Design an enzyme around this catalytic site. Structure first.
Site, mmCIF file in Angstrom:
data_model
loop_
_atom_site.group_PDB
_atom_site.id
_atom_site.type_symbol
_atom_site.label_atom_id
_atom_site.label_comp_id
_atom_site.label_asym_id
_atom_site.label_seq_id
_atom_site.Cartn_x
_atom_site.Cartn_y
_atom_site.Cartn_z
ATOM 1 N N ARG B 13 2.396 -6.630 -14.129
ATOM 2 C CA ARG B 13 2.777 -5.464 -13.355
ATOM 3 C C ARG B 13 4.234 -5.086 -13.638
ATOM 4 O O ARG B 13 4.620 -4.979 -14.793
ATOM 5 C CB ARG B 13 2.418 -5.691 -11.866
ATOM 6 N N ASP B 142 12.947 -1.308 -2.192
ATOM 7 C CA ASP B 142 11.770 -0.570 -1.713
ATOM 8 C C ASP B 142 12.260 0.750 -1.131
ATOM 9 O O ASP B 142 13.040 0.759 -0.180
ATOM 10 C CB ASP B 142 11.017 -1.403 -0.657
ATOM 11 N N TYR B 155 8.027 -8.588 5.867
ATOM 12 C CA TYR B 155 8.273 -7.997 4.564
ATOM 13 C C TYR B 155 9.477 -7.033 4.607
ATOM 14 O O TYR B 155 10.390 -7.101 3.772
ATOM 15 C CB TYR B 155 7.016 -7.281 4.011
HETATM 16 N N1 LIG Z 1 4.211 -1.741 -6.500
HETATM 17 C C1 LIG Z 1 4.826 -0.965 -5.618
HETATM 18 O O1 LIG Z 1 4.321 0.173 -5.245
HETATM 19 C C2 LIG Z 1 6.158 -1.339 -5.050
HETATM 20 C C3 LIG Z 1 6.680 -0.548 -4.022
HETATM 21 C C4 LIG Z 1 7.914 -0.862 -3.457
HETATM 22 C C5 LIG Z 1 8.627 -1.935 -3.952
HETATM 23 N N2 LIG Z 1 8.099 -2.686 -5.007
HETATM 24 C C6 LIG Z 1 8.886 -3.885 -5.440
HETATM 25 O O2 LIG Z 1 8.851 -3.939 -6.845
HETATM 26 C C7 LIG Z 1 8.720 -5.346 -7.253
HETATM 27 C C8 LIG Z 1 7.531 -5.431 -8.197
HETATM 28 O O3 LIG Z 1 6.348 -4.963 -7.522
HETATM 29 P P1 LIG Z 1 4.882 -5.434 -7.968
HETATM 30 O O4 LIG Z 1 3.889 -4.569 -7.289
HETATM 31 O O5 LIG Z 1 4.853 -5.622 -9.441
HETATM 32 O O6 LIG Z 1 4.907 -6.884 -7.269
HETATM 33 P P2 LIG Z 1 3.647 -7.880 -6.973
HETATM 34 O O7 LIG Z 1 2.621 -7.682 -8.004
HETATM 35 O O8 LIG Z 1 3.287 -7.757 -5.542
HETATM 36 O O9 LIG Z 1 4.335 -9.299 -7.121
HETATM 37 C C9 LIG Z 1 5.042 -9.621 -8.298
HETATM 38 C C10 LIG Z 1 5.001 -11.122 -8.565
HETATM 39 O O10 LIG Z 1 5.689 -11.781 -7.502
HETATM 40 C C11 LIG Z 1 5.459 -13.120 -7.643
HETATM 41 N N3 LIG Z 1 5.474 -13.906 -6.376
HETATM 42 C C12 LIG Z 1 4.788 -13.622 -5.251
HETATM 43 N N4 LIG Z 1 4.948 -14.621 -4.370
HETATM 44 C C13 LIG Z 1 5.725 -15.560 -4.974
HETATM 45 C C14 LIG Z 1 6.216 -16.821 -4.606
HETATM 46 N N5 LIG Z 1 5.922 -17.425 -3.455
HETATM 47 N N6 LIG Z 1 6.985 -17.468 -5.483
HETATM 48 C C15 LIG Z 1 7.296 -16.935 -6.668
HETATM 49 N N7 LIG Z 1 6.854 -15.768 -7.097
HETATM 50 C C16 LIG Z 1 6.077 -15.073 -6.239
HETATM 51 C C17 LIG Z 1 3.990 -13.241 -8.236
HETATM 52 O O11 LIG Z 1 4.046 -14.044 -9.410
HETATM 53 P P3 LIG Z 1 2.757 -14.891 -9.950
HETATM 54 O O12 LIG Z 1 1.673 -13.802 -10.232
HETATM 55 O O13 LIG Z 1 3.209 -15.609 -11.165
HETATM 56 O O14 LIG Z 1 2.284 -15.839 -8.834
HETATM 57 C C18 LIG Z 1 3.616 -11.779 -8.542
HETATM 58 O O15 LIG Z 1 2.955 -11.587 -9.781
HETATM 59 C C19 LIG Z 1 8.603 -6.174 -5.962
HETATM 60 O O16 LIG Z 1 9.880 -6.667 -5.588
HETATM 61 C C20 LIG Z 1 8.124 -5.133 -4.978
HETATM 62 O O17 LIG Z 1 8.482 -5.426 -3.627
HETATM 63 C C21 LIG Z 1 6.853 -2.420 -5.545
HETATM 64 C C1 LIG Z 2 -0.320 -0.855 3.434
HETATM 65 O O1 LIG Z 2 -1.107 -1.736 2.631
HETATM 66 C C2 LIG Z 2 -0.913 -1.876 1.278
HETATM 67 C C3 LIG Z 2 -0.035 -1.066 0.542
HETATM 68 C C4 LIG Z 2 0.124 -1.238 -0.841
HETATM 69 N N1 LIG Z 2 1.018 -0.451 -1.511
HETATM 70 C C5 LIG Z 2 1.405 -0.620 -2.909
HETATM 71 C C6 LIG Z 2 2.164 -1.929 -3.132
HETATM 72 C C7 LIG Z 2 1.559 -2.861 -3.993
HETATM 73 C C8 LIG Z 2 2.175 -4.076 -4.248
HETATM 74 C C9 LIG Z 2 3.396 -4.390 -3.666
HETATM 75 N N2 LIG Z 2 3.930 -5.604 -3.959
HETATM 76 C C10 LIG Z 2 5.115 -5.950 -3.433
HETATM 77 N N3 LIG Z 2 5.657 -7.147 -3.703
HETATM 78 N N4 LIG Z 2 5.790 -5.109 -2.632
HETATM 79 C C11 LIG Z 2 5.271 -3.907 -2.304
HETATM 80 N N5 LIG Z 2 6.021 -3.189 -1.460
HETATM 81 C C12 LIG Z 2 4.025 -3.471 -2.813
HETATM 82 C C13 LIG Z 2 3.397 -2.216 -2.551
HETATM 83 C C14 LIG Z 2 4.022 -1.171 -1.651
HETATM 84 C C15 LIG Z 2 -0.590 -2.252 -1.497
HETATM 85 C C16 LIG Z 2 -1.463 -3.069 -0.814
HETATM 86 O O2 LIG Z 2 -2.169 -4.054 -1.482
HETATM 87 C C17 LIG Z 2 -1.432 -4.954 -2.314
HETATM 88 C C18 LIG Z 2 -1.626 -2.868 0.636
HETATM 89 O O3 LIG Z 2 -2.486 -3.664 1.332
HETATM 90 C C19 LIG Z 2 -3.881 -3.365 1.319
#
Ligand SMILES: NC(=O)c1ccc[n+]([C@@H]2O[C@H](COP(=O)([O-])OP(=O)(O)OC[C@H]3O[C@@H](n4cnc5c(N)ncnc54)[C@H](OP(=O)(O)O)[C@@H]3O)[C@@H](O)[C@H]2O)c1
Ligand SMILES: COc1cc(NCc2ccc3[nH+]c(N)nc(N)c3c2C)cc(OC)c1OC
Ligand SMILES: NC(=O)c1ccc[n+]([C@@H]2O[C@H](COP(=O)([O-])OP(=O)(O)OC[C@H]3O[C@@H](n4cnc5c(N)ncnc54)[C@H](OP(=O)(O)O)[C@@H]3O)[C@@H](O)[C@H]2O)c1
Ligand SMILES: NC(=O)c1ccc[n+]([C@@H]2O[C@H](COP(=O)([O-])OP(=O)(O)OC[C@H]3O[C@@H](n4cnc5c(N)ncnc54)[C@H](OP(=O)(O)O)[C@@H]3O)[C@@H](O)[C@H]2O)c1
Ligand SMILES: NC(=O)c1ccc[n+]([C@@H]2O[C@H](COP(=O)([O-])OP(=O)(O)OC[C@H]3O[C@@H](n4cnc5c(N)ncnc54)[C@H](OP(=O)(O)O)[C@@H]3O)[C@@H](O)[C@H]2O)c1
Ligand SMILES: COc1cc(NCc2ccc3[nH+]c(N)nc(N)c3c2C)cc(OC)c1OC
Ligand SMILES: COc1cc(NCc2ccc3[nH+]c(N)nc(N)c3c2C)cc(OC)c1OC
Ligand SMILES: COc1cc(NCc2ccc3[nH+]c(N)nc(N)c3c2C)cc(OC)c1OC
Lengths: 250, 249, 251, 250
Positions: B13, B142, B155
């Site tokens: 991701r 975020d 969170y």
């Molecule tokens: N995706 C979004 O829409 C979104 C929105 C707002 C902010 N962000 C921020 O952007 C960053 C990347 O987002 P993402 O969606 O790619 O994140 P994600 O898939 O939710 O998590 C990224 C990685 O975090 C690692 N992780 C989780 N728990 C852990 C633990 N206990 N110890 C060590 N590593 C741990 C996992 O590694 P492993 O798979 O190796 O276990 C996972 O693959 C995060 O900081 C997230 O909060 C994302």
């Molecule tokens: C409100 O509920 C949900 C919202 C989202 N939103 C997208 C999404 C996905 C991964 C994420 N992972 C991390 N580390 N931090 C986030 N901020 C984050 C977000 C923002 C994703 C969900 O599933 C992963 C979910 O639960 C069903």
């Protein structure tokens, strides 16, 4: 029947001023304390002299640990045990000391104390307060200077930022229960006992509004407003009580 | 000699896209992972096929505990062991799940959510600074911290704390020439674990194109912040949210 | 001897409630109005029936123009002529309507009205208020809790309210040595237009976490009363949201 | 083939550096100026010597008045007249001087200049840019110190706060048209000779990152990022380029 409030870290200083003003407003109060037993008891004695059976003390360490949830549940339980209700929670207790990034307590302990007192205990207290439930509200003691923090206070600042997050998240989630969640953010208020007068004056001179620190009562006044009926539409708001300090550039 | 970067949660991701772009830019990379060993090694194999001995993996749980400080020291140490230097730290790894206020134990949820999003970043920051050019740290924040998902208090607390670390560490590490910045996604790579109905609902809220960010678009902001084009930027958090945070209820 | 307050746009709605609460608290009041003369006068007559010689009205257009500084000086002077003092200024009057960026008022008139009422008039009123003060003196600006999540196509309005936040901060800093505090109250959704369909009103109401209702004018006024009170004497440069949590709600 | 940009106040200082970097990136540029005619024409000459027919000057007063909308429309029209398109607008021109609240320009002139240049002209330019319409975007030059303003700069600070509001409002409203709207917020940059040496030194020593001002080029680097393909999901964002200045308490 008189409403009841829990004030954490209420033996002295700002917490005592909050407890006193709530009591003067007609609340029964739980004076939570950690180490300051004599001061807590002295305060409770004074308040009970004014109105019998309206103040109790409650001891607890609010350092993070696996028992902290139980300790926080017990603080709320203690208000119900004494007074049969719990209308107001004031999260005032707070550890504050530097944690430099570059170099007796272990870093684990510093995390547990600084993040526990400023953020995790408020969260757990909020859970327990809500689980137990009119004009219900929570007031969190924040910090007007979180975006212009003291040098080398990272963990403390992280804790106070997390408390802003809790204030917002809990205001959102507890609104359907009629529980308002707000903050009061001092700038410089009472300086520590340990601080010399010259250092105190250095901080005082920074404040635009009167070149003086907030009295404990001035901080308490904002808390009393937020708990009052005059704030019944206010939730998720943090009121700075800083004399303009946060507006002053470097 | 090529600069080196640590990326936490880099197997998949957004973290993976960040590691790939840093490597494409010329960095050697430490790919940290917790559970995703196979994906971490597959990424390392890909990057090492492009340039031999430029990617290594490092395993750690970033949950708060008595051993977290040592784990974080070792992540930074792994970069120095492999590459002899550590120029960039990206705090990307993050636990994310609801913790309702009214009804894992709650203390485990505190350890995971506050550990990954705030305490581990702090400890990694300490270790990074102690071990020390264009040095910088990028924290994945975020954009929705002030309009959080319902029932995500812990969170959200963790992400707020990460803003505070970004500011405090920018201030304190500036004399050492270490910049500390953030990138704040809105919605990016909505996962399968969301339902398709929830996914479309979020996407439709985004003013700019009614779509989520790609991982690569998030990575682009990280690349800017670590670059020479950002050498006066510290304490800044760049939203990469397509305007999502500007939209009222 | 009773303190005195100027409230702009005080004939109706939130400004009226603020003027009423200030009067109930013991202030003499200048009820500024632009078009609503009958309502301004009815309010004054009501307040003067309660306590003789405690309410006057003052008419002015607060649109930006070359005469606006004089108009604002005259509003403040009216308080001194009526009551011999001016302790509180509440900047409430405000134009609010959309100004789309892309395809009968000219755009320069829309600038004048929206930026004038929301920002420039507050600034000039603040200047005039302070100049007469060259005790518990303070200014309260009516802001908007939704300035960072604005209504679509309200750019000039939103610019004006952002400018008002900047005035609040700048004036708090600069007027602190004079003992004049400068603060704001930021409603979310308060009084909706009477003519707005209830179905549209309900769309807004349902967004509010705390009670799924708009703020009454009196609830907004309660925050103003706090800020001008002796219980707020260390508070300057602060803006209190009175929004029922609305601004915390994501899209 | 080459995209085109309008940069306001581009004859000197930060605006000049922005115009130069856009030009080096491949843009044709409209160099707007007010009083600095000789510098504007010299810059256009320099850029045209590098690539012929890629730079023109455009003179306008951006003070608020009833003709300001026409003037702003004419600046955008000048880009279309020279280059057949207008892909980027940079709102950089800005009046900056104190306007004390308590006592040769009249206050109405001060309002017109400070609010016109910093806010109203950006709004009208944004309107005209949008109406006349790929990687389209607008960059507004903001101020990292808007919440910790210089003493006695109320009108200036109002103008910059209004510019933040425009950035947000226009990002929201223009997103469906594919036009991104962002900001760059300097702290201290390229302190002018006119500023006293003592005051310059005092501001430079406040900056945590290197105890120095930003170069104009460092400000321009952030503008270049925001207009680039590497920022295609970024709208409504304001990037501080301040060396940590805004983080420093009084
Ligand atoms: N995706 C979004 O829409 C979104 C929105 C707002 C902010 N962000 C921020 O952007 C960053 C990347 O987002 P993402 O969606 O790619 O994140 P994600 O898939 O939710 O998590 C990224 C990685 O975090 C690692 N992780 C989780 N728990 C852990 C633990 N206990 N110890 C060590 N590593 C741990 C996992 O590694 P492993 O798979 O190796 O276990 C996972 O693959 C995060 O900081 C997230 O909060 C994302
Ligand atoms: C409100 O509920 C949900 C919202 C989202 N939103 C997208 C999404 C996905 C991964 C994420 N992972 C991390 N580390 N931090 C986030 N901020 C984050 C977000 C923002 C994703 C969900 O599933 C992963 C979910 O639960 C069903
Ligand atoms: N004073 C200021 O200038 C200032 C400025 C900004 C913000 N604030 C905030 O306003 C609030 C009140 O400030 P203050 O100066 O009055 O606070 P303080 O004196 O520093 O601390 C208040 C109380 O916190 C309790 N506490 C500390 N560690 C604890 C622990 N591990 N477990 C349980 N309780 C613990 C202590 O109780 P015992 O004495 O019983 O051990 C102490 O009396 C705090 O939240 C503070 O952060 C104050
Ligand atoms: N209502 C809400 O939901 C809401 C939400 C957010 C913020 N607010 C803020 O709270 C304040 C009060 O809101 P409201 O709804 O009561 O306001 P409003 O009814 O829209 O307007 C208040 C008064 O402003 C005066 N005004 C308008 N244009 C003027 C001009 N050119 N010159 C002089 N005065 C002028 C009018 O006076 P006359 O009638 O005498 O002509 C009008 O009655 C405003 O600042 C508003 O922005 C309200
Ligand atoms: N320099 C800093 O430390 C700093 C700090 C914070 C924010 N900023 C922002 O960054 C931007 C660039 O800063 P800077 O220091 O380079 O600006 P500057 O030198 O103060 O002004 C830039 C140009 O603005 C134009 N301008 C002024 N009044 C005008 C009017 N009435 N009509 C049209 N144009 C007018 C002038 O053009 P002519 O010379 O052709 O008359 C001037 O050269 C500004 O928006 C500024 O507010 C700068
Ligand atoms: C910048 O250095 C320092 C500043 C201050 N300021 C006043 C002060 C006093 C107690 C406090 N107690 C808590 N709970 N949180 C605070 N925020 C706090 C502050 C802000 C007090 C100090 O001594 C403890 C100190 O260290 C020398
Ligand atoms: C987005 O659409 C609309 C929303 C609202 N909301 C309530 C409302 C009413 C008066 C107001 N008056 C001023 N001075 N400022 C405001 N902020 C304001 C608001 C917020 C009122 C409308 O009609 C006046 C309207 O237009 C249909
Ligand atoms: C507080 O007093 C002063 C401060 C500064 N600061 C640097 C400076 C220079 C040009 C500027 N130009 C604009 N458009 N906007 C600014 N923000 C700005 C600044 C921030 C420069 C001064 O002289 C040019 C001055 O007056 C003595």
């Amino acid at each position: 029947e008189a409403p009841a409030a829990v004030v954490t870290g209420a033996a002295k200083r700002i917490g005592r001023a909050i407890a006193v003003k709530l009591h003067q407003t007609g609340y029964r109060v739980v004076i939570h304390y950690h180490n300051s037993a004599e001061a807590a008891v002295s305060l409770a004695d004074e308040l009970n002299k004014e109105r019998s059976n309206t103040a109790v003390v409650c001891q607890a360490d609010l350092t993070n640990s696996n028992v902290l949830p139980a300790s926080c549940e017990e603080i709320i339980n203690s208000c119900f045990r004494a007074f049969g209700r719990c209308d107001v929670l004031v999260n005032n207790a707070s550890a504050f000391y530097p944690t430099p990034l570059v170099q007796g307590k272990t870093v684990e302990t510093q995390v547990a104390e600084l993040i526990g007192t400023n953020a995790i205990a408020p969260f757990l207290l909020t859970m327990s307060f809500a689980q137990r439930q009119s004009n219900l509200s929570i007031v969190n003691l924040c910090d007007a200077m979180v975006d212009q923090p003291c040098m080398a206070f990272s963990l403390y600042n992280m804790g106070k930022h997390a408390l802003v997050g809790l204030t917002q998240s809990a205001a959102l989630e507890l609104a359907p229960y009629g529980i308002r969640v707000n903050g009061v953010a001092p700038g410089v208020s009472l300086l520590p006992v340990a601080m010399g007068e010259e250092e105190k004056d250095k901080w005082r001179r920074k404040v635009p509004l009167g070149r003086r620190e907030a009295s404990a009562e001035q901080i308490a006044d904002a808390v009393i407003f937020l708990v009052s009926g005059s704030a019944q539409y206010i939730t998720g708001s943090i009121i700075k009580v800083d004399g303009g300090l946060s507006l002053v550039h470097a």
